[PDB]
Ligand binder design. Structure first.
Ligand code: CUA
Ligand SMILES: [Cu+2]
Ligand SMILES: [Zn+2]
Ligand SMILES: [Zn+2]
Ligand SMILES: [Zn+2]
Lengths: 238, 188, 382
């Protein structure tokens, strides 16, 4: 047992779907908690997508998962979508929320609370590591890319928000006006933690068992260290 | 025979429940959940808290307790077909677990996010806190545990050439644990 | 909403809002409502709230049920943060456009720098109509006149869809062959590679080139349309014009101030002394958004929020006219459900049992001095 190559190919397929789901939503889940926690956001508002901070932190704080899941999926499956799978995860996460809550519940216009576009970067990462399949290599040029591409990647969206207007006697860009018109409040609680720091790890991950095999290898969040490759990207702005 | 739509339950069970919640807070987030110091907040929101905690303790008790006591006592010999039937049902647990994580960590969290932006808080117990923290997290950490326990107590991995695949299926769903074995560092 | 749960003595010793007024109380979608008033930044600013070196003049309401059309403090438009100077006193003006039907509790707040949204009195304003009615037009220095409600909406969408699609496309492409267990094992026993098969690498670099190409093509297309563009305008306005109040003519000195626990009233013993010629009377003590009036001397007409106006809340042992030259000591009691409903009563938990308010004196022909008092406020239990 189990029977034929016909059926084997079958269970291994219906597995692929179930697994892909798990992998994908568990990413969406913890990846979104990450972005959130570290960036109370620039991402939230059109008028925070600036040239210095937004351009600097976003690709930096964001390589982590790509980098990590990259070193599992390619190393162990030769599946080269490590990076992009995370990015798609975050994006769906953020959108369903921006739409059904940010606008849906409290009424912020979508043209305001839209998220930053991320796919390009991830493709650069995924492909660069696929072709010329050294991590070291991807870490230097691949992250480099992810970093740089970020802003130009958002420019087609951002740009029309940056057309100038004389608003009651002061220069302001569209986006400025947006945040000025659509009243938000303070910032106002943070330590979104106790069970998020620990508890809801050390029931998810005991992964361990006591049996080892923990692909708890993220020495490939060295692959992070393309912050440096990143933080060119901002001295890139003016 | 094989893997059933209990997996259908596992998906809808959250989705109905949470879509009810989203309705419930959608309608009471405005009217009741605005001013915490008002009596309608006591009844529609505060009461909600102790309702869920009790329910959570209770479920988590019966749920983990259930599986542990129904732990497959002598599993030394139980067919490879069950060692297949099982790390299917096991996967269903892990699907439910992920779905749960999704709601808790993406949905309800970035919602709390929006909520903070629009009302200056009156308690550490806003609607979206009653929901994000004390309803969402518990639910999915409970689902978490169950998954873990099921596997620990059910599957014995827990102490052409289509060919070089087809027959790599005696102790395959080792895979089962290259993946609980790698949500691993993925989650934290 | 949001005050009440916040430390009573911060709420007493931070910003005093007075001469508050609301142009209208019921308003149709797309109609305007104007909020005016003065606010004084208390000279004894708590510790533990960064001075308002960079503060911002905000509005408290459940999201954009109004949009803020304009906000002025001093003569000036204030779309930035501003530097407020302690002790000083300013006039503001906030202009709101209605956008969502409902009864909203609108406050004039003040966001400060380090610690604290400083939330002024809230007034309920009702909006009738359909959100589908709302418009937010703006004309650019670029000729075009756009509706902010939806400007660039479709564009945003396209790009996110387009890219999202690609991410899918790439994962999709690999996921047409089997994804996990066969691939896993093939890596395991024997070398991998059999499984990434150039022309896979053709496609890979296909994507890679295509992507950077689309990015620059797109970017310079975005640049051809929208050739005139500026960076986000920001940075704290300094130089806020304060209000040139004249020296008050009454001076008051407060020895003892007490409140019953539990209770609804604060009492203080003030020595009022009336310099400058015209018999003066005490008409009001404003403390933390809550206004206590002697209805024998002063009567609000501003439509002040009901739950915060104590119409005859304020009682003075002797409030006959105080003749000019004279000086008397008087026992004064601020009393109202409001004192408990807004939890000023919670001063008992604050680590600094000192209060602060404004007194308003009116002379015979009805012109008024305002003096500010502050002192320690001691509980009594027995
Ligand atoms: Cu919120 Cu008054
Ligand atoms: Cu003052
Ligand atoms: Zn065969
Ligand atoms: Zn929160
Ligand atoms: Zn009225």
């Amino acid at each position: 047992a189990v029977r034929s190559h016909a059926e084997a190919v079958q269970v291994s397929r219906t597995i692929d779907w179930m697994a892909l789901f798990v992998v994908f939503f568990v990413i969406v889940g913890s990846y979104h908690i990450h972005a959130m926690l570290t960036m109370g956001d620039w991402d939230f508002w059109s008028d925070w997508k600036d040239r210095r901070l937004w351009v600097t932190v976003t690709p930096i704080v964001l390589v982590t998962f790509p980098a990590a899941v990259q070193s599992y999926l390619w190393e162990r499956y030769r599946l080269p979508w490590g990076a992009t799978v995370c990015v798609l995860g975050l994006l769906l996460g953020e959108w369903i929320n921006r739409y059904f809550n940010f606008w849906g519940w409290t009424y912020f216009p979508i043209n305001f609370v839209f998220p930053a576009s991320l796919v390009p970067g991830a493709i650069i990462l995924d492909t660069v590591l696929m072709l010329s399949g050294s991590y070291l290599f991807t870490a230097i040029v691949g992250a480099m890319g992810w970093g740089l591409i970020f802003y130009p990647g958002n420019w087609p969206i951002i740009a029309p928000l940056h057309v100038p207007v004389e608003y009651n006697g002061m220069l302001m860009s569209i986006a400025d006006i947006q945040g000025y018109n659509y009243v938000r409040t303070g910032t106002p609680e943070y330590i979104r933690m106790v069970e998020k720091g620990t508890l809801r790890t050390f029931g998810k991950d005991v992964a361990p068992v006591s049996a080892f095999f923990s692909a708890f290898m993220s020495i490939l969040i060295y692959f992070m260290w393309h912050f440096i490759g990143r933080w060119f990207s901002n001295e890139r702005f003016l | 025979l094989l893997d059933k739509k209990w997996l259908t339950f596992a998906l809808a069970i959250y989705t109905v429940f949470y879509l009810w919640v989203r309705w419930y807070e959608g309608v009471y987030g405005w009217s009741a959940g605005l001013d915490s110091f008002a009596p309608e907040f006591e009844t529609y929101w505060m009461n909600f808290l102790y309702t869920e905690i009790v329910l959570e303790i209770v479920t988590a008790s019966i749920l983990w307790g259930y599986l542990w006591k129904t732990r497959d006592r002598n599993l030394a010999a139980l067919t490879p077909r069950e060692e297949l039937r099982r790390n299917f049902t096991h996967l269903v647990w892990l699907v439910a677990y992920a779905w749960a994580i999704y709601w808790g960590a993406s949905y309800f969290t970035e919602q709390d996010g929006t909520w903070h932006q629009t009302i200056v808080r009156d308690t550490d117990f806003t609607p979206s806190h009653i929901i994000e923290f004390y309803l969402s997290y518990p639910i999915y950490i409970i689902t978490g545990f169950a998954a873990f326990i099921y596997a620990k107590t059910r599957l014995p991995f827990f102490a052409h050439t289509f060919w070089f695949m087809e027959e790599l299926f005696v102790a395959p769903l080792h895979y089962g644990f290259v993946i609980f074995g790698w949500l691993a560092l993925a989650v934290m | 909403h949001g005050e009440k749960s916040q430390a009573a003595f911060m709420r007493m010793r931070t910003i005093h809002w007075y001469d508050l007024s609301w142009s209208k109380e019921k308003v149709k979608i797309n109609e305007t409502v104007e909020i005016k008033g003065k606010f004084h930044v208390f000279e004894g600013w708590p510790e533990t709230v960064d001075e308002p070196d960079v503060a911002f003049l905000n509005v408290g309401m459940p999201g954009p049920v109004f949009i803020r059309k304009e906000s002025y403090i001093g003569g000036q438009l204030v779309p930035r943060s501003v530097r407020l100077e302690i002790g000083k006193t300013y006039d503001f003006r906030v202009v709101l456009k209605a956008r969502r039907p409902g009864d909203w509790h609108v406050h004039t707040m003040m966001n400060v720098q380090g610690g604290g949204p400083i939330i002024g009195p809230g007034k309920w304003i009702t909006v009738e109509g359909s959100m589908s009615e709302f418009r937010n037009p703006v004309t650019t220095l670029t000729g075009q006149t756009v509706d902010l409600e939806n400007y660039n909406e479709g564009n945003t969408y396209f790009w996110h869809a387009f890219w999202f699609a690609i991410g899918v496309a790439w994962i999709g492409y690999w996921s047409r062959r089997p994804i996990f267990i066969p691939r896993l094992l093939m890596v395991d026993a024997g070398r991998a590679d059999e499984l990434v098969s150039a022309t896979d690498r053709k496609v890979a670099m296909g994507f890679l080139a295509a992507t950077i190409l689309i990015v620059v093509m797109a970017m310079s297309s975005a640049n051809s349309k929208y050739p005139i563009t500026i960076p986000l305008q920001a940075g704290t306005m300094r130089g806020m014009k304060p209000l040139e109040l004249p020296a008050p003519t009454v001076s008051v000195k407060v020895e003892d101030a007490t409140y019953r626990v539990p209770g609804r009233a604060m009492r203080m013993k003030l020595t009022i002394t009336n310099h400058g010629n015209s018999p003066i009377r005490l008409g009001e003590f404003y403390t933390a958004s809550v206004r206590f009036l002697d209805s024998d001397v002063y009567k609000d007409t501003t439509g002040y929020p009901e739950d915060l106006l104590a119409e005859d809340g304020l009682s003075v042992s002797d409030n006959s006219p105080l003749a000019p030259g004279e000086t008397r000591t008087v026992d004064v009691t601020a009393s109202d459900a409001a004192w408990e409903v807004y939890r000023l009563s919670d001063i008992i938990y604050d680590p600094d049992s000192r209060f602060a308010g404004l007194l308003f004196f009116f002379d015979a022909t009805g012109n008024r001095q305002v003096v500010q008092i502050d002192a320690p406020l001691i509980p009594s239990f027995m």
